Amino acid sequence: NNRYDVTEWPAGNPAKDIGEVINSIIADIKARQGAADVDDGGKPGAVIYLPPGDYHLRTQVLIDISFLRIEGSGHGFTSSSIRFNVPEEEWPDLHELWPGGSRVIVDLPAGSAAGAAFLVAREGSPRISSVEFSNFCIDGLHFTADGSGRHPENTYANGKTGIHVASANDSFRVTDMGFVYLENALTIHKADALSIHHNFIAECGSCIELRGWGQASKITDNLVGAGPRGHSIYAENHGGLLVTANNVFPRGASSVHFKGVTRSSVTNNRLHAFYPGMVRLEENSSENLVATNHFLRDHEPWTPFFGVDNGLDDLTGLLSISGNNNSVIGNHFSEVVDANEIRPEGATPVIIRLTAGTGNFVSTNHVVAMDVDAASSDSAFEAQVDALLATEAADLAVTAVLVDPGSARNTILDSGSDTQVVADRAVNAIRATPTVGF
Amino acid sequence: SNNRYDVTEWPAGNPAKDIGEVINSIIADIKARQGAADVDDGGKPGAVIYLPPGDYHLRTQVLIDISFLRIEGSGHGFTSSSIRFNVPEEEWPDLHELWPGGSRVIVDLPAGDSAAGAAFLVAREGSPRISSVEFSNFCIDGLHFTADGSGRHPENTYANGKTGIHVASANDSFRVTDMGFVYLENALTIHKADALSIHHNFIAECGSCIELRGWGQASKITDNLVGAGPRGHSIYAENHGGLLVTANNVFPRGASSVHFKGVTRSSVTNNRLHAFYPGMVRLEENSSENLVATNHFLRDHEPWTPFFGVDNGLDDLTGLLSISGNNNSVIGNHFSEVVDANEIRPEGATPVIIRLTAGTGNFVSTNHVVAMDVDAASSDSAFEAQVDALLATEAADLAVTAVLVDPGSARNTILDSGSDTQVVADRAVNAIRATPTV
Amino acid sequence: PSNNRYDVTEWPAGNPAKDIGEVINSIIADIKARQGAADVDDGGKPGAVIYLPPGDYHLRTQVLIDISFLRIEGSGHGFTSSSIRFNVPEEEWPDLHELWPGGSRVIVDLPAGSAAGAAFLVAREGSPRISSVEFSNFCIDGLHFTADGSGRHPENTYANGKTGIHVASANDSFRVTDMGFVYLENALTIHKADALSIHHNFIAECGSCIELRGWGQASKITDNLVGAGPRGHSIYAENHGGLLVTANNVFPRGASSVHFKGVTRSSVTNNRLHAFYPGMVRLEENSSENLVATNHFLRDHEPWTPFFGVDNGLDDLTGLLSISGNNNSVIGNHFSEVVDANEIRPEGATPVIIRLTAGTGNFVSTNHVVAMDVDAASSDSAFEAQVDALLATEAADLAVTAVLVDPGSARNTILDSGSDTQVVADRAVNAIRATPTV
Secondary structure, eight states: OOEEETTSOSSSOHHHHHHHHHHHHHHHHHHHOOOSOBTTBSOOOEEEEEOSEEEEEOSOEEEOSTTEEEEESOOOOOOHHHHHTSOGGGGGGSSOOSOOSEEEEEOOOOOOGGGEEEEEOOOSSSOEEOOEEESOEEEOOOOOOOSSOSOGGGSOOOOOEEEEEOSOEESOEEESOEEESOSEEEEEEEEESOEEESOEEESOSEEEEEEEEEESOEEESOEEEOOTTSEEEEEESEESOEEESOEEESOSSEEEEEESOBSOEEESOEEEESSSOSEEEESSOBSOEEESOEEEEOOOOBGGGTTOOOSOOTTSOSEEEESSSOEEESOEEEEEEOGGGOSSTTOOOEEEEEEEEEOOEEESOEEEEEEOOOOOBSOHHHHHHHHHHOOOOEEOOOEEEEEOTTEESOEEESSSOTTTEESOTTSSEEEOOOOSOO | OOSEEEGGGOSSSOHHHHHHHHHHHHHHHHHHHOOOSOBTTBSOOOEEEEEOSEEEEEOSOEEEOSTTEEEEESOOOOOOHHHHHTSOGGGGGGSSOOSOOSEEEEEOOOOOOGGGGEEEEEOOOSSSOEEOOEEESOEEEOOOOOOOSSSSOGGGSOOOOOEEEEEOSOEESOEEESOEEESOSEEEEEEEEESOEEESOEEESOSEEEEEEEEEESOEEESOEEEOOTTSEEEEEESEESOEEESOEEETTSSEEEEEESOBSOEEESOEEEESSSOSEEEESSOBSOEEESOEEEEEOOOBGGGTTOOOSOOTTSOSEEEESSSOEEESOEEEEEEOGGGOSSTTOOOEEEEEEEEEOOEEESOEEEEEEOOOOOBSOHHHHHHHHHHOOOOEEOOOEEEEEOTTEESOEEESSSOTTTEESOTTTSEEEOOOOO | OTTOEEEGGGSTTOOHHHHHHHHHHHHHHHHHHHOOOSOBTTBSOOOEEEEEOSEEEEEOSOEEEOSTTEEEEESOOOOOOHHHHHTSOGGGGGGSSOOSOOSEEEEEOOOOOOGGGEEEEEOOOSSSOEEOOEEESOEEEOOOOOOOSSOSOGGGSOOOOOEEEEEOSOEESOEEESOEEESOSEEEEEEEEESOEEESOEEESOSEEEEEEEEEESOEEESOEEEOOTTSEEEEEESEESOEEESOEEETTSSEEEEEESOBSOEEESOEEEESSSOSEEEESSOBSOEEESOEEEEOOOOBGGGTTOOOSOOTTSOSEEEESSSOEEESOEEEEEEOGGGOSSTTOOOEEEEEEEEEOOEEESOEEEEEEOOOOOBSOSSHHHHHHHHOOOOEEOOOEEEEEOTTEESOEEESSSOTTTEESOTTTSEEEOOOOO
């Protein structure tokens, strides 16, 4: 009946090597489903079920058939980041130490496709289609030394990937997953009509990367947190991408990063970063809608990462655009920084920066900037919650919109006062937000 | 063994008579088997408990004190007990069915200490926080509402002291998805939530639906269908930062649609909100730096006879959206105010749509207010009354105050959200641009 | 069985390969025989779940669903592009890895009727309304399109008289989730819906995808991937109030992306919409008080030879967004109009983006229009040229009319949605603020 359970397969042992088990199942599917056109069918695929459990993967799973679903019964997330920064003598008193759910422990050596627990690859025609990953946990266990000289467990470096799709694909789904302690959670090349929906992708170096090219895809309703040298959501050479209803929290280098992305929408997300450069439209990213997002940029409050950042200064912008004919409408920006820590020394922080391109429409954006002392404490979630709720601050001067001379013929409306909008009025259409009074 | 249980395949007790006893027995088994936290990089992966479709009485509270527990069913099972209990009792035997169904947990607990009346209590102290508990695709039914001295018929009081799911302890990465809740005084109450997702549920005919209490961070409430009772909350949060509330369809008859106390740096964006009373969206007690964008607000009069004279106590000067806090952003919303002028309270008042009661720096831009003077048509048949009222747009104009800025609020910016007559505010101390008119 | 769980491959004497319709009807009869009493121990008709493992199932008898709380579920949406495959020369088929859709696949082998041609018919009259039926994560495939006198190749006609799911009766709290629909004249037709959720489906290569007929209220269509055919609807609703349409990625080639007739107090917000024809979003027949916000619209030319000269009959004066109704709100949308200037229809016309044909009090604000001139080009490549065309931004400017107000619409407000030249409207009876120019 094309239904498998990894705990009820005679070949191998999913505790020891679930990779071998799953590959054996896939070989069985292929052996049974050899003919493509028998009574209007023949290759319907299969479902592989992972009950809740701790499964070591020592052999990469190769998925090269369409319509394979791999499903579990728990996303299994717990903060290994918190646990590895608890003093080791206290570990025996903790209720648990590791992630759980339907848990795939990635025990591969470092790559980068070779370090992927699941590799989806098939060449030829048609494109591999409608593979589904649902409601299981992929755990890379540890981060290791890399010459950054953070403590090993804080480097976000292990060469491991959760799911890597190498080949052109159509109608794929990744839903309800948990990813933790992977250098790369989810990397999908050459995607068409993909949906990445309602996952929990956190404490990974990079979370979601859509590479090569793609079209007509969506990234929706995810909880996402990356590492300071990595991407939270990245896409390149995608057209018609929809990124919406995500809650992106620290500490990726950025929240959303586009290279050559066109005719797409980044709308209605909540985005929180500890560094500038939250949303980056780069390399001729054009005709995109960036609307009704909530941006917060503030200072890392947790001691283990307090001095760690992404190398970008406060002139970068929270939103940076290099490309034509984009639409930036109805966003909220909260810039909550220690004025003494602003870089370069004596700079006015920038919120929206247009570095290149023409015809960008920036309207009806509210910028709120305040000066607060940067505080540091060891207790992660208490420090995080307190910092979000603290509104004890002085108003801070900011540049709401900076139009560099290399970007022209833009339209900037109701997104700051005249002093807050730094731009050449002769070659841009600028309407300052109305001033208080008569 | 494989950590998968089915409540109809347990040796002891009877899930039809007391599923609580059965689930607790299962949890005891899980704990007995999963005693070690660090055996081969695992040891406490949790489990899944499956409820097939069926009618299960719960007489003992379920206590969940382990991480990575999933409780799942095969049907949200909603039917309108409210409609049924307002059908004359002598006609009940002729109806196709009476009760909710699906994978149905009937809450037969006495009133609580409201935690004591919860069918499912999630509580664990110490470290780490309990994490990644999942509730999926089952039905929780409080069966009846009871007399409370309100003067309403007993089944219309929204009172029984029962909760569906109560999370007492700090928690991380919890999920509540695909549920049905019905006839509970409180459907879902979660304290101290971090990175919680309440997604794609059906939460209706409950006194209060979703309450996020204590504090919280980085959570989301998405894609829900929600309807509460006139003394209760539809969506409530307190001391949350970075909450995302989006893509919900909130229908009557909660006291409010969305109610925030001390909520900061959050987004209430792209929801459909329908109320029968003023005070639909309330930002209270220093709720600051929030985005309230591209929501559709409808306020009209209750059309269903059993509740025609029942309300939330608030008059038409309250506002549909009321803000007490700093630096919020109210952008791109639609407000339909559809009321009978003779029913306006107090007598002869001009209804207010957006009210800023306190705070500075609020940015209110590009909001369309539509106000109509209609009749008060009522009907004994619920879905007929409701559908006919939504489709009726036959009406003369009603004068309203689109934006009221109280003297306790100043330094706000109000743009294209009403004509000068429609914006009641001190022009000396706020920045005001009237919507252009002809 | 006593626990209300059925698997179509385990049904005694049934053969779901030959006729899964007969199997499912037999299962429904079994459920009804066991669940005859509505009110025993506060229950009695909880419904059931029917599971379809991955496999190829022919349906030769229509399934009639006339019970509440029935869930039909599978383990794969199973989509592959039959459109691409049927346009690959037949001599190349042997080298293709697969030829057909898969997953949990229901092949609709019914003759043309339109409810008679539906694989699943949901019908029950009387009281209460049938409630909380759920369809989840399976595939419905109409197999072939057939000759219809249009002169297209048979497999390109989008004509076969088959429906996936047809709900004929008033319904409450229904769900359609995670499905795949392919090669059906009508995917999903739901009459008289209340509090329906159509969420996270893949609905493509169907003549029409989603149609909500009769009337309805308080429903939502969210997070779907949708592509229809040139004579049909992508998303259609009539006489609905309080409908939320959001987070959908609608791609070609429906006659429209979203079509409303008599729809009121609803929201079409935060979708990505791509069409090869004008008339992408149509608000018709007194569609009033709707919010159309922060959508991304792209209109360009079909690149794929088999459909290059096929269209929806509408000229470039139609508008991308057309409104006939009162008091709507069109806020924060992005429109990309990418067409061949030499081939605009009618000859000599200037394309229109937003058209108000009738009605009063429409508020159109803060919309960005981007128009460019690109030559139309045909080729047989079935995804490469589609990706390439989305990514290409290589063009001359094209003059368009951003907002056209016909004399039959008046008392509208048009702000920052075009230059004075781009807004064609009677200034005596409409309030116009031109986008500031440089």
